Write a protein that binds this ligand. Structure first.
Ligand SMILES: [Mg+2]
Ligand SMILES: [Mg+2]
Length: 227
């Protein structure tokens, strides 16, 4: 299909986020590339307003599931690529257990040959010395499954999954994710059977980078449907 073909090679990615968490306003710009043939993403994010007022790991899911590797036998379930190039809206509520929540609204679409993720993020109800505003989360990331289901009335998909952020004391900060995606354009989109995405993520630092930043290497594979 038209959308699938846009992802057979390496695609440059841009990410732009504006955020307000408990009145702390910040912006992040990211760049990298995705190779959906291998489910592979490489991204570097820079906080352009100074120090990021929340922990970098809490923004990983917000900062392009069109780069998931869908096995050939699962291609009819790939909503994300099917919406391209016009793209999709991706909305989430991320609920940090016993703490605040993020509400995010993003548009993921091509600008020319570049896949862009533009995000507005609003965070409220955070505790001043909770794990988020208190920067008590380790700089690392766990592997997760994301269960995707069709959202037919929206001509899109939804998902609900749990992200676990490691706390510096050895505990875990749960971040419940609820997600809804809607296509922007008028092309035919794929409405999938229930399936999951399996995600692994590695966070690192650029040793030569003095701005506040995050380097992310991620692999995403669709699964849950046998051939
Ligand atoms: Mg810039
Ligand atoms: Mg631990």
């Amino acid at each position: 299909s038209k959308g699938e073909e846009l992802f057979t090679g390496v695609v440059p990615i841009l990410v732009e986020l504006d955020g307000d968490v408990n009145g702390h306003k910040f912006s992040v710009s990211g760049e990298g590339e995705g190779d959906a043939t291998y489910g592979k993403l490489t991204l570097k994010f820079i906080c352009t307003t100074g120090k990021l007022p929340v922990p970098w790991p809490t923004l990983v899911t917000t900062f392009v599931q069109c780069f998931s590797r869908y096995p050939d036998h699962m291609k009819r379930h790939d909503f994300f690529k099917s919406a391209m190039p016009e793209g999709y809206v991706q909305e989430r509520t991320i609920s940090f257990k016993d703490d605040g929540n993020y509400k995010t609204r993003a548009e993921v679409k091509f600008e020319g040959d570049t896949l862009v993720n533009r995000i507005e993020l609003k965070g409220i109800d955070f505790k001043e010395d909770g794990n988020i505003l208190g920067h008590k989360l380790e700089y690392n990331y766990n592997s997760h499954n994301v269960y995707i289901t069709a959202d037919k009335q929206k001509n899109g998909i939804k998902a609900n999954f749990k992200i676990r952020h490691n706390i510096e004391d050895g505990s875990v900060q749960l971040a419940d994710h609820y997600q809804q995606n809607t296509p922007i354009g008028d092309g035919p989109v794929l409405l999938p059977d229930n399936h999951y995405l399996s995600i692994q993520s590695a966070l690192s630092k650029d040793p030569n980078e003095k701005r506040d930043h995050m380097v992310l290497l991620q692999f995403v594979t669709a699964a849950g449907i046998t051939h």
